[PDB]
Design a protein around this motif. Structure first.
Motif: not given
Lengths: 237, 261
Positions: B50-51, B54, B69-72, B82
């Motif tokens: 994921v990182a 980004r 954005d990313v949100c768990a 996620v």
């Protein structure tokens, strides 16, 4: 000459606030951030972590404190979480939540940690692949007239300096590229100062690395001075 | 918080809804992925992959969608959800080609979309990224003419939750290669579909899917010409793309510098 533009961008995306203590934080003071930072440091050293783990962690910790009030009682739990995530990002065998907790004399619990992890990563918008000063030291190092022998010595000394800066408020004001420049400069100076034939990259290195970074060489000399003074307080220990 | 208001559809990677960024206003593509909530919290692979994506945003490369954005969320003792927040193009390729004035050309639309396409594809390969699931569902195009690659590297994210053969190269799934040339094949497949406006070598199981290919093109095994719709250099090239051996095969970088301009 090319991919550095991206490191300079990224770095700027993951920049903490130099005012978070006054504007966001209420309980947490610098003195505490230092207690926690040097705890974090002793954990990394005890555990033979990848060198990039500590500075990245403190990157997380300054960026989170820049967006969240934390209770001085939850601060060590934030340090721990930042090491947990840093380690996942930079290590083949990352730290276990259980082993981080052991270093808090079990004053926290894996469950607390795992909760924080989600907080920390969500507050950072999963922007965890940040630039540490190690990414630059190595960029700088690869543009320098130096035998590998010299390069690995300069690299050891700079990493010392970097760790030292990390436990200090400098790290909040100066971006990792600066921190790495001043460190290399300091390292290479001192080394040449002891062996005048050698370490000749010392010559105009400040300006040279400013060229690389695209910045004012005055700041780099200012930043460097700070590291050398800050190191004078490190003998005391 | 984000609020949804459409669905680009049901894709290889589940449902891809659509929302607005409250303050910024812009449109957002929302995807999701279920991962296991282990005893080590967030699974390593997920944090890392994921990182790594980004990070890419730092380059600001125009021929690629921006993971913004990313949100768990879900914290059941055994799963985490996620939410991937992306940049939204309104029209993908498929819709954009239909449209096109019959017979659906000229070439200074193709030639330049095949250029924008190959750029975002070389960039990824520069960062040690393979797409593997390259589709026109993906290849979004802005109401301004900029192609923007779509769902990259997500294969390595959706490994859990996952546990259209139309475009896969000979390497997959005959093995599973997941090499980098796999994208250079699916470029030639999409390359033609720009003309014919739909898939040569499409449909059926790996057997037929891979059988259909040995019709045109001819390591080995044991079972079972050009036919061009206008260009030679476009054939000279599209066949360098669609070479069987991935090693003796064209590169997104090579390609961009071929006589076809």
């Amino acid at each position: 000459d090319r991919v550095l533009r991206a490191m300079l961008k990224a770095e700027e995306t993951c920049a903490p606030s130099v005012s978070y203590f006054k504007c966001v934080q209420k309980e947490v003071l610098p003195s505490m951030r230092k207690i926690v930072a040097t705890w974090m440091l002793e954990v990394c050293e005890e555990q033979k972590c990848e060198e990039e783990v500590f500075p990245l962690a403190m990157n997380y910790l300054d960026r989170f404190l820049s967006l969240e009030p934390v209770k001085k009682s939850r601060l060590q739990l934030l340090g721990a979480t930042c090491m947990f995530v840093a380690s996942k990002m930079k290590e083949t065998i990352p730290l276990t939540a259980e082993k981080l907790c052991i270093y808090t004399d079990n004053s926290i619990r894996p469950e607390e940690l795992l909760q924080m992890e989600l907080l920390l990563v969500n507050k950072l918008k999963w922007n965890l692949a940040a630039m540490t000063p190690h990414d630059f030291i190595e960029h700088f190092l690869s543009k320098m007239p130096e035998a590998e022998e010299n390069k690995q010595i300069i690299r050891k000394h700079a990493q010392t300096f970097v760790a030292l800066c990390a436990t200090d408020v400098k790290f909040i004001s100066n971006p990792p590229s600066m921190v790495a420049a001043g460190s290399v400069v300091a390292a290479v100076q001192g080394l040449n100062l002891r062996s005048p034939n050698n370490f000749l990259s010392y010559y105009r290195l400040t300006r040279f690395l400013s060229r690389v970074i695209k910045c004012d060489p005055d700041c780099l000399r200012a930043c460097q001075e700070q590291i050398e003074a800050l190191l004078e307080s490190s003998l005391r220990q | 918080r984000y609020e949804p208001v459409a669905e680009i559809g049901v894709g290889a990677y589940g449902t891809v809804y659509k929302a607005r960024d409250p303050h910024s206003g812009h449109f957002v593509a929302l995807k999701s992925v279920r991962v296991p909530n282990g005893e080590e919290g967030l699974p390593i692979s997920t944090v890392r992959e994921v990182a790594l994506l980004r990070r890419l945003e730092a380059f600001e490369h125009p021929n690629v969608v921006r993971l913004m954005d990313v949100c768990a969320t879900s914290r059941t003792d055994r799963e985490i959800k996620v939410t991937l927040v992306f940049e939204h193009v309104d029209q993908d390729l498929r819709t954009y080609l239909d449209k096109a004035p019959p017979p659906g050309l000229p070439a200074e639309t193709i030639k330049d979309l095949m250029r924008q396409f190959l750029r975002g594809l070389d960039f990824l390969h520069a960062n040690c990224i393979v797409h593997r699931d390259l589709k026109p569902e993906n290849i979004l195009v802005t109401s301004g003419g900029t192609v923007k690659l779509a769902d990259f590297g997500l294969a390595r994210i959706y490994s859990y939750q996952m546990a259209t053969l139309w475009y896969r190269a000979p390497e997959v799934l005959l093995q599973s290669t997941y090499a980098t040339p796999v994208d250079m094949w699916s470029v030639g497949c999409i390359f033609a579909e720009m003309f014919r406006r739909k898939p040569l070598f499409c449909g059926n199981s790996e057997a037929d899917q891979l059988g259909k290919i040995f019709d045109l093109i001819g390591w080995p095994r044991d079972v079972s010409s050009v036919v061009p719709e206008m260009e030679e250099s476009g054939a000279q090239l599209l066949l360098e793309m669609l070479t069987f051996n991935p090693h003796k095969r064209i590169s997104a970088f090579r390609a961009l510098q071929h006589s076809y301009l």
